[model samples]
Target chain A: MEKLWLNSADSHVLEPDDLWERALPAALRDRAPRCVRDNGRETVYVDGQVVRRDPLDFADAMRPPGALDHHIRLKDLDDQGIWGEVVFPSRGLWTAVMTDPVLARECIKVYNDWLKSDFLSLSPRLVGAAMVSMLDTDDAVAELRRAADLGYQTVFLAATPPPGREFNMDVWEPLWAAAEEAGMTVSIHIGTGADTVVARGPGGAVINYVETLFPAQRAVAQLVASGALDRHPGLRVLIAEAGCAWVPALADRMDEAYRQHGMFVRPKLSMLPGELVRRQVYASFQHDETAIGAVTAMNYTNVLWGSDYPHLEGTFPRTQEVVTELFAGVDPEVRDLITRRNFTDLFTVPALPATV
Target chain B: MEKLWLNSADSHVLEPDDLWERALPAALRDRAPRCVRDNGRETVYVDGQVVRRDPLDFADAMRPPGALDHHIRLKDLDDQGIWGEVVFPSRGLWTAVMTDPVLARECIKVYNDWLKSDFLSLSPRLVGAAMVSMLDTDDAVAELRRAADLGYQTVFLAATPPPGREFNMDVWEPLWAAAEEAGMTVSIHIGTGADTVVARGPGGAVINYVETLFPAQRAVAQLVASGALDRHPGLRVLIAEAGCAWVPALADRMDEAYRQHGMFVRPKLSMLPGELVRRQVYASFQHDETAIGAVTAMNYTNVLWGSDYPHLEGTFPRTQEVVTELFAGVDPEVRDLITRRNFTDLFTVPALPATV
Candidate 1:
């Protein structure tokens, strides 16, 4: 099988252990997000509150050589035939759990600065997604502008928001406007913002993994239904790692609710929910056969491919094998749109070397 | 266009207002699922606890002629070209929220008895799903046997279980075994067993409706992952009113997690997760175009069409129109499976009259 050169719409970067301590002031360093490893368990603390706990070795087992090192990651991407990648934060996702707006803002700033300086600067192919403080939309917009100025292509938002600050509420208006104005895509990654572990029985591993996909779907509904995307037409939102096929299916469900429950609908949109989704919403999937059908049959052309590199559920070392099997006997136009063109259309990536 | 006969995998029957009051003993009458209507709002109380509240007129608007009457429902079904319907309870769904095991058990028994005597007795086409108390497995299993004895083809289970009684837990083993023994299909209807209303923002109606689907998917994950279905191979579970396409997509995701996260998996399944789902799980969809693709492309042939009769979210007066457009260019064999054969395969339905 011939190698298919692709660009990943989703990937991740693991922040250094001493990131907060090295970047923040003495008074705020302890309160910022930090990780404590002991007895093979990794516990994440934010503002003196324990937010996450996981087996350290389990995480270590999923990591590729480029998991922490950007220099090595670029080589990994090249070897896998991936020309460009949209990178999200791993540990920095806990910033969404922080209750203190000040702490959240400071920590996000430190992370974004380090992302641009240390990782993204290494290669034009490394498209780093800047983290924003979701506790306060004003702070989020301000940081979004700063990140855009720093040449970041996308802004990461938690799929789950704080208790009262859902993505559908008007509180996120400014952030939407800012993202639209700056042309930076709003990237909502699954399994972030809140506890993704809703079930832990029987097929706990699969159940828990599938649980994460729901929030990403909700994020799309909230933004589209709230007229967030309709209000800002250029503001695109991508639900990362949730697969592509469900996006159109969700749009159809939302359209039914919009039409069937029209009387109960508030903030009516300029277009149907599915129309806005088709125009503004993008989704990233690693290895789903139905995702192609979502494009050819459903006419939802915003599907993009992602390696989700270095994650256990990702296509890292097996990118060539996975894409080859996934796209065998498929149209080259659809395959190109999903594997390469969609990523380039979303973010500015270095052009691939001319192929013979 | 010719009318297509469809056996609806999902529909609802609204119990009479005085069902509990007339059926239960004097001591339990007042506390056994009573409704109070005042100020255009309807409030439901179960065991002296407020369980549900809705605007009276909003619910009234969605009800068709057969909503509260079985005789009229048969006419409505015939008019809609639906020959058979698997009917679920409306008010009796509140029984899932009851804290008292005795109250829950008694209430379910009263509802099941009335369902058989008044509703299912009216026509063989009215396939009533008997309600089982989820508060206690013993009660649930005992009632399952009773309902099956009464010729109930299916037992209704809530998509969301009580706090500690998730479907994937070993506690549900007896219920699975009992249902398998009796040849009763386990019917899990979405938006029950918990508050389906999670979001109340701009698109609250759609968001809340879509939120109901996630729990149904989780129920599938729990049952399949827990080896409950694997242990009782004859046991079949149907996720009703949640679109069918996601069923196959979920199976693929579960397969990935089962293989990728194989080390963390417990109660190792006799087959892969997807295989278990393909063998025993069924899903019902209403007006989903992609549902056909789930069968033809993904090879998940267990897709069944539902009218969700009398509800605004359903195709009531428009079942013919919806199915016509949905199956326009589709094959007759595939359409037969979704619109007719799959429903008959799951439940024993009355045969259509011979046509000259």
Candidate 2:
């Protein structure tokens, strides 16, 4: 068996500054997102509203002199022995924060164009997920087509969607169909969507960070139970930045509830929820041992290793160190599946993310 | 090893007719919770608000001749070969649905007394968790103390708390302390808190039912990360009817975020989140194979099996049948832990839950 160099199922491309300023038309430039530094804290504003605030200086945290530069990121990926990386949005998920769907649509297009022409262009090792507007699925679907044509492998979704438009609701069906038809994986990334609410007191960060995972879990459950996966056999979902193990665990519960509450179940599917999950659901983990153990112990195989490169919480400088510890004493086959097999299978890419 | 009789971590006593009407004083009699049947359908009302509605003949569904009768319940338990069961409220969770704290308190007390004087008095095998007010934690704590003194082994919380009163908030600290000091297990039961919001379209019931499990998972995460379990090492938590595997999976993710985001974590935990969960958190499943696998694979021992007696979704008349299937070819030690050992550990039950 070949010991494959790890391919990240999840990662991020820090958007280059002035990305929107350079790509968007003159009319929307004034309203484009901007970053400001305050007392070493970085705050991002979109349309005059604070969309994201970093408690500490995030500038120093980004390794490599030019962290946002596409070529620098590619070198960093190779330095860490990563073969390919599925890259998601950094600030572009804030598209949900704006009320104007037109502006949101335009912002995402700029972001997607930049990703295809810049980041994904640097190496076949970089797989770009095109950002779509969370506010409008019609526009979201249109963008998905645009991005797929431009060679993006996946469609990015905010872990949480705007109010009245939860992932489970019927409103998202059109987009689901589009992504499935396009053979594009729907990648739900955590810590995005809307502004996060820090818990009231102690363990605030722990609370908020863990809270980010709930939407991702809910999104998958809804997709499976709603027959989104059942109807579209080709559809695959990647719940990003959310640790693995829960995927199989939830699938089991969903199956139990389906069978136990079958009398009340509506629009019954052709397959069991667990079967659907086994076929379609995929998740990524950074440094969870249980996530690794779950592969053989729980007999669950839909897992991928991710470095979450350039993020302070990720396994960047120590990608190999983390992978070594995670796979120590683990079966070679299981390690291969989790670290690389699944990544390559999910994004077959017709030979890596395509370019316009 | 001798064959083990199952000890269910979750079950429900079908409340007898006129339970609240016979217990509450005249002034509140008109407003007391009641279930009405019309055209073969059962609907419950509390203070003029429609609290719960079911399309089946629930009374007839409570089978084996006398499922609601205390003596009959024990016989039913014996017939099914279940040694013990942690019984929680059914419609009594509507205590949270009522806005008046005073009324909620009285309704819960009546429910608690009936559980002790009636069902629990029949057998040590039939342990009942006493209901507490969800409106005020102070009231909840007072009821918890009363229930413990009266020999209830577990204190019950609706899986979802009243509006603005989620279980994760500090408002629950006092209640947590009381349960810990009294040696009572805190049990969060699903299908409570509020009237279920059916998903907008298909898979309504299946979606809504599985949705309940999320809050229960969230509640445990908050308690662990908030240091409630960390502070009160003796405190035990039972997430009822939510199955087992998710507990350890969530604990793993919580630990990762807690450590990875340590810069923003406050009230630092003494032990890692997973360690605390292994030490304190418990979950029960009705019919999930993954639950059994979780024991050896994930190394999570805090699992219990439940009959969920008389509920359509539970393994009731076929308890033995389901147990045999669930434990087929399973190790004796793991089966012992999940089926009985964990339940007994959570609630040692002093003096057989007190005679009337």
Candidate 3:
């Protein structure tokens, strides 16, 4: 049950309070994201909207085991037997909710800049996905080009895009074109979208948490069914934070529908839905073992493993233990594909330290 | 390959267009569901709302070989090696959209009467699922009791309930109780619910068709996570026309989310999601080979075979051949569990004729 020095496909970064305050112009500084501690409550605000609120100990929560210090996180990766990681954002998801395109563009650009000059500079092992404003395709593609030029290998998108702006629509075609042209992977992260409908009964929290994955699945379905992947075979789409096994199973379902409902299907594609899914779509899971079997059972190979560092629902403190239990006696090739190879194929991971 | 005579867990009966018109009183006859054909188009209106529209030759689409004729369907089933079958209604789904509970109740009553007196009476192997009005749980339970008394073995629910009405909520508890008490399986059929958002791009039909499976998945997740199944151990849930492999995989995801996000889970269940899924829930698949493996890999044995009979997407002309290819190398025991044994376990099917 020895763990491998895995490269994580999903992780997170918590931006400092002054990220936009220091970066935005005078006209927008007051609207920048910041946290206020008063009345025994810690409240976070972005663009004059309350983004999060928690008990006063939220500060301790913010700078939890992996936040507030990059070196500590790197050490944490070592302690967990992780060699490299792809970093998403904490509050940056709120940028997707910003209705004003201009403001969203500025906020996204500043975040990407900070990620490149500050975070990625801290270590070659930290691969940061550059954020882009999805409100306007033109702005999103431009920022995607800029991020790619800045050497970021992946472009971040909220799994649930704004209403009427789903990933499978014609609206996202330009972004797909740009991502393909820039040779960047489109990273659609779950739990990153603005609030919408979710399961809300007794166990709503668990059901809603599981519900967030629907949009990720939708994004993949749209991409494959919309001919986005067939049109741009080189465009790589990653459904992050969602487990992996469902993708192949969904692809099988989609293929069945495609074949059975052929007359009703529009804009026929060059390949079947399953073929497109295998060729361009990838899914990352934190601790799902079935993801390993999806390779042989459903013939999908683009599964990636992650630690989801710093999140409460992640395999952070027990990354090594979780990986050992998950990969116990799993085929070496399958284990390598899910734990290490698939990750490095998407983002570069530095060699392990000589001491290791 | 010697194909076995299977008991199909899923199939459909295309109700005569004039069923409600012939059964309802004069005052309600005009409002009864009916079809209007003109200029190469067929429009179905129920409760004054246009429910469906297809080609003028829609009857040609409808009475495909086994459709519109009980004897033909029985012969077709036997020809395809099917010994017993569970039958769902076609246009009966519009009964769910009937906002007026009185109208819905009467319409459902007539449909159940027709199913039992006409369709089920046609053959001992035909099991008809009685449709109930979800608009009123009291009415639903009453009708469920009546149907149970009439020897109906399953209760039919449109996978998509009316707006603001979902299966997981308290509104359906009484009906769940009645179904549980009656020892009747709740058979939820896809493609029956009221229209909402679906695929609308290049792969729109395929994507939207695949989208149909979500409601079924949500039904399972909500029932399991909401303690519905936990509360009613005898209640059996069948997701018809949706593939089976995805259920085990989704249950795995639900369990992962349940355990990983334990702080958020509520109404703690006595068992995990996977266990509940394997125990009381069943899924029917027509052409998914991956479903067979879920039995072994996922340790879930609730997979059931389906024909989706007369529907263009089903294994109608080649049900036997498709099943033969599907179970070619499959272990006989597991194949039996999926193809026929599971179906018999849910609904009582008499032993095969001695001639067979």
Q: Rate the local accuracy (lDDT) of all candidates.
A: 0.85, 0.78, 0.82
TM-score of chain A taken by itself, candidate 1: 0.96
Per-residue lDDT tens digits of candidate 2, residues B68-182? Answer: 6677777777778777777877668778678899889998888889888877777776688888888998898889888888988888887767766765577888888888899
Which ranges in model 1 have alpha carbons more than 4 Å from their true place?
Answer: A36-38, A58-62, B353-356
Tens-digit lDDT string for candidate 3 (B122-236)? 8889888899887888888999999889999999998888876777688888887888889999998887778756555567777777777777777787888888898999999
Model 3: how far is B40 from its true place, Å?
3.9
Candidate 3 TM-score, true structure as reference: 0.95
- TM-score ranking, high to low: 1, 3, 2
Per-model chain B TM-scores are 0.96, 0.93, 0.94
Mark the 10 consecutive residues where model 2 chain A has the least summed lDDT: A347-356
DockQ of 2: 0.51
Estimate candidate 1's alpha-carbon lDDT, on a 0 to 1 scale.
0.85
Per-residue lDDT over B1-356 for candidate 1, one digit per residue giving the tens place of the 0 to 100 score: 33788889998888898889888878788888778889889898888788878899886876766797677888888788988899998889998888888888988999999989888888888798999988999899899998888889899999988998988888999888899999999999998887877687787887887888788888898888888998999999998988877787788778878877777778789898888988999998887777887787677888999999878889988888999999988888888888888787778876775231
Off by more than 4 A, model 2: A1-4, A57-66, A69-71, A168-174, A195-198, A348-356, B1-4, B58-64, B349-356
What is the Cα root-mean-square deviation between model 1 and the actual structure?
2.0
DockQ of 3: 0.60
What ordering of candidates by lDDT runs from best to worst? 1, 3, 2
Clashes of 3: 1
